[PDB]
Amino acid sequence: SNAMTDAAIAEKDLGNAAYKQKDFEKAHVHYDKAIELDPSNITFYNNKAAVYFEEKKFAECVQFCEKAVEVGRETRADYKLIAKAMSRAGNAFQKQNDLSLAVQWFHRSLSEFRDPELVKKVKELEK
């Protein structure tokens, strides 16, 4: 789109390079800068969620998944990337030993985009 939205992407790319080295602090710095430049881009919220998940900050991961979903809907982003946020949230809830919330999110995710592996995973979790 514009000078700002390109600038944001460039910060995301810097965040990914830190993320790839497991420098999670620096990854957040850059993704935060991305969101500062262009808060309408779902990718930044999902990438921050992914960092939080690897840090075992599962409640923060969920919070950013929730942001991705809200942003994704407001901006009419690719519904598949909204589904990804939803499954990530489900996984973060599993890691918190919260099956109830995990399954709520997984069902959201499947309704957003039918992931064949997740369908099987959810049936197993509901056994």
Curated annotation (Swiss-Prot):
- What does induction of this protein depend on? Up-regulated by heat stress (at protein level).
Which stretches are TPR repeats?
8-41, 43-75, 83-116
The record's subcellular location field reads:
Cytoplasm
Which residue stretches, if any, does this entry annotate as coiled coil? none
Could you say which tissues express the protein in this record?
Answer: Expressed ubiquitously in the whole body. Detected predominantly in the pharyngeal muscles, vulva epithelial cells, striated body-wall muscles, spermathecae and intestinal cell ring. Also observed in the tail regions of hermaphrodite and in the sensory rays and spicules of males.
Tell me the null mutant phenotype: Reduced brood size and decreased fertility under heat stress. Decreased thermotolerance and shortening of life span by 68% and 77% at 20 degrees Celsius and 25 degrees Celsius respectively. Growth of gonads is hampered resulting in shortened arms of the gonads, abnormally shaped spermathecae, lower sperm number and endomitotic oocyte development.
Q: How does it assemble?
A: Forms a complex with hsp-1/hsp70 and daf-21/hsp90. Interacts with daf-21/hsp90 (via the C-terminal MEEVD pentapeptide).
What is this protein's function per UniProt?
Plays a role in gonad development. Up-regulates longevity and thermotolerance. Binds daf-21/hsp90 and inhibits its ATPase activity.
Please state what the protein is called.
Stress-induced-phosphoprotein 1
List the source organism. Answer: Caenorhabditis elegans
Q: Which residues of the full protein are shown?
A: 1 to 124 of 320
